[PDB]
């Protein structure tokens, strides 16, 4: 159990026996209670997860960013936009640090209709447990961390999880480089412990089963044990703003935030990947469906990175 | 009397001195003249810094070259670049020249590199100052410790932007420094890491302090080192400068600094004449005869 | 002799106080793992114990 199956595959909130009218439209006038400020509230929150936005609304700028950060885009014509809520779209919002209350409050504030309880339930189901805890990997130490001790305290009550924790501490630094000693700054909002090297594989199932998926982050920079290959980007590599933000989203905290990146065909997708590899400066495994991608990557690495034919291998 | 030292709490300890007053004064302006920011984060998300004991790390040098190149196109008139050490400066320039970055910088502004030769210093400053006034534009680069940060004031068009590459730590001559540091631990109980921070911060404050000398003067200032983001280091900068060093501009990306600079330049390149200065930041005899001047200025003073 | 004593005295304090705090932190983590203490306050209690030692 690692795919967080329930909200993804079970989709508890998908309607059945929908009150489809004679015209064939879903009659949600009754399901979506009428609410005031039809001119100031730019959203419609359909109970099936679809959301509609007005590109001409005065708050469209914020509402667009709001929907872009919370829902998957469907269509963006000149005057109206369509978005669809999904567990993965919601989990992406949670991992950014957005709270269920804030999401519900701003939705209720921007929605022309009251938010349907089924969508509010889907919001809860996809925000309460979906990403409140992080699995740091620094110095080869698997540290489990959460912004709130409340989340880990509940998690730590699990006897199987308790068997995973390791009693270790970790040091500071010397005057040669006492920033690692000054890394004791901001231990507020920070609580973590090490987990035994081999328990992770089983603990992951247990935490996801326990409804607390771990946000794994690899601290490639301070990991001393995995040797660096001095990988670096060629001056030919210039990051486009979307690429820069995509990497910012990934490396924003400083560690490689594991996850999925979506880049439409034609983007400098390879430049983003090569930059990520050049940023990690650790040995990288790359997977494709054909030897063509393998040599296509190799050629793109040659043009944007220092990595040699003694170092890139098919 | 000048505004360059901070924190004031360390000088009575260091100088084994006890002043009657330990005050500071807030820069009072109707239109700010200064936008201190810490661009500690590269576009490639590399933590731009010199934390690595000044070790050869091309990734930060590369990022330093990218920042300077784009900033050379953004800042008008002259730029003044301060390195943490002369060695690192020379090492850095050689890399940027080898990587060709330096040629793109020349296209943007005339580079003038400092050297211990008074002939170089005098000629560089001669050509730089007038290059900043002729049709072209120039970009002075020097070391945060050298006399250039001491004898030259970057007034008005000269050095409209000051860039501090890395925290100015002198880890060379550590033995003599250790001895003085140790003696400070002994008779003054001053922590070495605390003193080191202060000592570098005061040098950064020197470059910044010489970047402005009037109200019809302004200076962009980039602190290209993650270190500066620590509350301790930021907290030890001059309080009147910290006022403009808003958290929102901490660990900015290169692009953010470029955009903020374009914005900051746009916001202050606009006409603002002597008559416009009489609204706030300038008090005439009429305002002096008005007791308001007596009560309003009270809050300008600061203490530490 | 004082130079030797100064170094050792300083180093012993640093090592002890640093690790002892993380020893309390380990206990604090043991409490979060198995105690029923108020999780919102348990952090403040840990900060109390450590600050009382640091001060």
Curated annotation (Swiss-Prot), chain A:
| Residues that hold ATP according to the record | 263-270
Q: Which domain of life is it from?
A: Eukaryota
User: Impact of altering residue 86 to P?
Assistant: In TTD2; mild; wild-type dual incision, opening around damaged DNA and transcription by TFIIH
**Coiled-coil regions listed in the entry:** none
Report the function annotation for this chain.
Answer: ATP-dependent 3'-5' DNA helicase/translocase. Binds dsDNA rather than ssDNA, unzipping it in a translocase rather than classical helicase activity. Component of the general transcription and DNA repair factor IIH (TFIIH) core complex. When complexed to CDK-activating kinase (CAK), involved in RNA transcription by RNA polymerase II. The ATPase activity of XPB/ERCC3, but not its helicase activity, is required for DNA opening; it may wrap around the damaged DNA wedging it open, causing localized melting that allows XPD/ERCC2 helicase to anchor.
Pathological condition linked to this protein in its record = Xeroderma pigmentosum complementation group B: An autosomal recessive pigmentary skin disorder characterized by solar hypersensitivity of the skin, high predisposition for developing cancers on areas exposed to sunlight and, in some cases, neurological abnormalities. The skin develops marked freckling and other pigmentation abnormalities. Some XP-B patients present features of Cockayne syndrome, including cachectic dwarfism, pigmentary retinopathy, ataxia, decreased nerve conduction velocities.
Q: How does it assemble?
A: Component of the 7-subunit TFIIH core complex composed of XPB/ERCC3, XPD/ERCC2, GTF2H1, GTF2H2, GTF2H3, GTF2H4 and GTF2H5, which is active in NER. The core complex associates with the 3-subunit CDK-activating kinase (CAK) module composed of CCNH/cyclin H, CDK7 and MNAT1 to form the 10-subunit holoenzyme (holo-TFIIH) active in transcription. Interacts with PUF60. Interacts with ATF7IP. Interacts with KAT2A; leading to KAT2A recruitment to promoters and acetylation of histones.
- State the encoding gene: ERCC3
Give the stretch of the parent protein shown, with its full length: 34 to 391 of 782
UniProtKB/Swiss-Prot annotation, chain B:
Q: Where in the cell is it found?
A: Nucleus; Cytoplasm, Cytoskeleton, Spindle
Reported effect, residue 29 to P? In XP-D; the corresponding mutation in fission yeast causes complete loss of activity
Mutation: residue 225 to N; reported impact is: In XP-D and COFS2
- Coordinates of motif Nuclear localization signal in the sequence? 226-239
Region Mediates interaction with MMS19: which residues?
A: 1-181
Maturation and modification: ISGylated.
Taxonomically, which superkingdom?
Eukaryota
Q: Give, from the UniProt record, the effect of changing residue 146 to D.
A: In XP-D; combined with features of Cockayne syndrome
Look up what happens after changing residue 202 to H: In TTD1 and XP-D; able to open damaged DNA and incise damaged DNA
Query: Changing residue 160 to P: reported impact?
Result: In XP-D and TTD1
Coiled-coil stretches noted in the UniProt entry, renumbered to this chain? none
Question: What mutagenesis or variant effect is reported for residue 160 to W?
Answer: In XP-D and COFS2
UniProt disease annotation? Xeroderma pigmentosum complementation group D: An autosomal recessive pigmentary skin disorder characterized by solar hypersensitivity of the skin, high predisposition for developing cancers on areas exposed to sunlight and, in some cases, neurological abnormalities. The skin develops marked freckling and other pigmentation abnormalities. Some XP-D patients present features of Cockayne syndrome, including cachectic dwarfism, pigmentary retinopathy, ataxia, decreased nerve conduction velocities.
According to its UniProt entry, the function of this protein is described as:
ATP-dependent 5'-3' DNA helicase. Component of the general transcription and DNA repair factor IIH (TFIIH) core complex, not absolutely essential for minimal transcription in vitro. Required for transcription-coupled nucleotide excision repair (NER) of damaged DNA; recognizes damaged bases. Sequestered in chromatin on UV-damaged DNA. When complexed to CDK-activating kinase (CAK), involved in transcription by RNA polymerase II. In NER, TFIIH acts by opening DNA around the lesion to allow the excision of the damaged oligonucleotide and its replacement by a new DNA fragment.
Q: What is known of its domains?
A: Interacts with GTF2H2/p44 via the C-terminus of this protein; mutations in the C-terminal region of XPD do not alter its helicase activity, but prevent its interaction with and helicase stimulation by GTF2H2/p44.
Protein species of origin: Homo sapiens (Human)
What's the name of its gene?
A: ERCC2
Curated annotation (Swiss-Prot), chain C:
Gene that encodes it: MNAT1
- The shown chain, on whole-protein numbering, covers 156 to 210 of 309
* Superkingdom to which the source organism belongs: Eukaryota
Q: How does it assemble?
A: Associates primarily with CDK7 and cyclin H to form the CAK complex. CAK can further associate with the core-TFIIH to form the TFIIH basal transcription factor.
| Location within or outside the cell | Nucleus
Explain the purpose of this protein.
Stabilizes the cyclin H-CDK7 complex to form a functional CDK-activating kinase (CAK) enzymatic complex. CAK activates the cyclin-associated kinases CDK1, CDK2, CDK4 and CDK6 by threonine phosphorylation. CAK complexed to the core-TFIIH basal transcription factor activates RNA polymerase II by serine phosphorylation of the repetitive C-terminal domain (CTD) of its large subunit (POLR2A), allowing its escape from the promoter and elongation of the transcripts. Involved in cell cycle control and in RNA transcription by RNA polymerase II.
Q: Name the source organism.
A: Homo sapiens (Human)
Q: What is the lineage of its organism?
A: Eukaryota, Metazoa, Chordata, Craniata, Vertebrata
- Protein name per its UniProtKB record: CDK-activating kinase assembly factor MAT1
Q: What tissues express this gene product? A: Highest levels in colon and testis. Moderate levels are present thymus, prostate, ovary, and small intestine. The lowest levels are found in spleen and leukocytes.
